[PDB]
Amino acid sequence: MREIVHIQGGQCGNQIGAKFWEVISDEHGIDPTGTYHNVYYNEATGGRYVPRAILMDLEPGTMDSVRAGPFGQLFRPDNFVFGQTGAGNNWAKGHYTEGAELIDSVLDVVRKEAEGCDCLQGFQITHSLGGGTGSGMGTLLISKVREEYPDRIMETFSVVPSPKVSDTVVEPYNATLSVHQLVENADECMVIDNEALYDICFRTLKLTTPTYGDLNHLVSAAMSGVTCCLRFPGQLNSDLRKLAVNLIPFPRLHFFMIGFAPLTSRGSQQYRALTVPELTQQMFDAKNMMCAADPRHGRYLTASALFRGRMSTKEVDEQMLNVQNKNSSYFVEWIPNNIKSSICDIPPKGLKMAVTFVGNSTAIQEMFKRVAEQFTAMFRRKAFLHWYTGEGMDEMEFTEAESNMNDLVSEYQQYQDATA
Amino acid sequence: TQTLELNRMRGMLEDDFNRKKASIRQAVKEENQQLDKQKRDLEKQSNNEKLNYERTEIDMVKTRGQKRP
Numbered sequence: 001m002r003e004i005v006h007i008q009g010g011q012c013g014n015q016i017g018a019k020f021w022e023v024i025s026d027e028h029g030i031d032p033t034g035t036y037h038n039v040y041y042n043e044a045t046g047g048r049y050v051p052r053a054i055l056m057d058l059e060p061g062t063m064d065s066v067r068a069g070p071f072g073q074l075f076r077p078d079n080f081v082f083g084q085t086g087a088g089n090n091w092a093k094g095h096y097t098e099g100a101e102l103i104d105s106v107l108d109v110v111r112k113e114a115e116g117c118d119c120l121q122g123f124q125i126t127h128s129l130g131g132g133t134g135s136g137m138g139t140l141l142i143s144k145v146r147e148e149y150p151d152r153i154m155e156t157f158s159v160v161p162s163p164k165v166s167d168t169v170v171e172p173y174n175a176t177l178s179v180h181q182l183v184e185n186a187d188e189c190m191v192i193d194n195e196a197l198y199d200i201c202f203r204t205l206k207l208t209t210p211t212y213g214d215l216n217h218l219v220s221a222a223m224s225g226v227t228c229c230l231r232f233p234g235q236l237n238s239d240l241r242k243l244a245v246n247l248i249p250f251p252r253l254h255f256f257m258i259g260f261a262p263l264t265s266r267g268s269q270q271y272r273a274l275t276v277p278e279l280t281q282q283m284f285d286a287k288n289m290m291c292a293a294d295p296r297h298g299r300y301l302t303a304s305a306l307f308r309g310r311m312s313t314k315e316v317d318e319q320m321l322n323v324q325n326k327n328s329s330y331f332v333e334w335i336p337n338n339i340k341s342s343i344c345d346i347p348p349k350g351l352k353m354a355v356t357f358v359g360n361s362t363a364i365q366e367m368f369k370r371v372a373e374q375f376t377a378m379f380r381r382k383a384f385l386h387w388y389t390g391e392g393m394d395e396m397e398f399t400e401a402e403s404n405m406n407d408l409v410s411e412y413q414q415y416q417d418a419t420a
Numbered sequence: 421t422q423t424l425e426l427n428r429m430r431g432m433l434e435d436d437f438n439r440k441k442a443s444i445r446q447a448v449k450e451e452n453q454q455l456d457k458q459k460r461d462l463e464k465q466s467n468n469e470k471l472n473y474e475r476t477e478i479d480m481v482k483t484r485g486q487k488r489p
């Protein structure tokens with residue numbers, strides 16, 4: 001009955017997964033032992049609950065990571081598959097030689113869990129696109145599972161590489177090789193990049209020392225709010241498929257943007273009473289999204305907004321109408337009423353209102369444009385190319401991947417410029 | 421007068437027959453209401469008993485530390 005498996009991958013994917021599971025346990029009132037105080041969790045002996053997630057990585061460090069953090073005992077060792085080497089920023093080490101001998105086993109633990117459900121609404125993945133482990137393994141796994149269950153949808157909660165504040169020197173190769181395959185067998189590539197997360201956590205909460213825990217917690221909140229309207233009843237209910245239908249007009253313009261609301265700090269908290277138009281103004285601000293792409297620099301093909309709490313639906317729909325009608329330039333003409341709404345009935349822990357905004361918008365082709373820029377700048381010199389040539393990989397796959405990337409960005413551009 | 425004495429006979433007999441049948445139907449409804457409590461309570465008992473037994477099993481399993489000779 002509309003269940004969801006939660007596959008992870010790579011160190012960042014594993015961190016985000018642990019954070020998401022503890023946040024969901026907080027919302028659903030579970031404690032770090034798995035006792036109350038079917039869509040996500042599974043029942044187990046003694047009234048215990050275990051998350052329906054699998055955890056894969058080539059290095060065993062993340063094992064001790066997810067064991068060390070709170071709510072680490074919710075999981076089950078049958079879903080702790082782990083290699084030994086660790087890709088170490090070698091995408092091929094996660095897709096052809098080393099990752100393969102793991103993914104096979106992972107398939108089992110997927111089908112050891114998929115058939116456990118009865119009406120599987122679809123999967124969801126949490127990983128990075130720069131790290132060899134996450135990117136490569138998750139890409140091969142997407143391939144396998146989309147070959148297996150083509151009927152269900154496969155969300156990919158991916159964190160694209162930090163465009164300007166790079167932490168590794170091999171980001172472009174892995175990002176391009178991953179996107180080339182993700183654009184085919186995925187349905188929801190909601191991109192996140194740490195540039196936007198630091199921007200938000202600095203200039204919207206005045207925080208002191210933002211560690212990765214806080215970014216993971218923020219992405220966790222957004223992840224939850226995305227499907228909470230299905231987890232709970234509502235005056236106007238949605239799901240993981242209504243979103244897909246109302247968000248993509250063509251089989252490959254499915255790359256989204258994510259936004260959360262509300263977010264303020266203590267000083268700004270004591271003011272600014274909570275009311276739906278204020279939430280709208282905070283949600284449609286440019287810098288208030290998880291993507292380092294000023295959305296004004298593009299148009300919104302379409303955008304859905306899921307509210308959580310008790311409100312007045314007329315106010316919701318009228319705010320949506322006003323905001324799509326006043327700023328008609330930034331929205332696209334050849335499609336009408338291009339905004340979408342939904343409303344749940346249970347907000348988060350002690351938050352009388354909550355907004356989660358997901359937008360398919362052609363303002364995000366710039367991210368791929370600049371990543372491909374870095375790629376082509378690093379490729380015409382064959383720099384750091386032996387590390388990949390050594391693994392049976394050739395040089396044709398790279399130019400094919402870059403040409404597919406450029407075909408995708410050309411699709412975005414071409415069917416942005418169109419009219420009626 | 422005779423035909424009225426007889427029509428009242430028919431009327432009383434029928435308005436007694438119908439009330440009797442309705443009483444039978446209400447008694448059957450009560451019997452089903454009663455039967456429902458059995459499946460309302462046996463399942464509760466079995467649920468609590470499974471809880472107790474499986475909790476005791478979890479305890480007995482977890483109660484395996486180390487020996488250290």
Ligand SMILES: Nc1nc2c(ncn2[C@@H]2O[C@H](COP(=O)(O)OP(=O)(O)O)[C@@H](O)[C@H]2O)c(=O)[nH]1
Pocket residue numbers: 009010011012013015016087088089128130131132133134135159161162167168194212215216
């Ligand atoms: N929000 C967040 N981003 C991370 C985290 N860890 C790494 N990133 C970024 O993701 C990239 C590294 O990916 P990583 O998972 O370490 O490599 P992998 O082990 O091969 O999957 C780098 O761009 C990191 O900056 C994390 O824990 N939280």
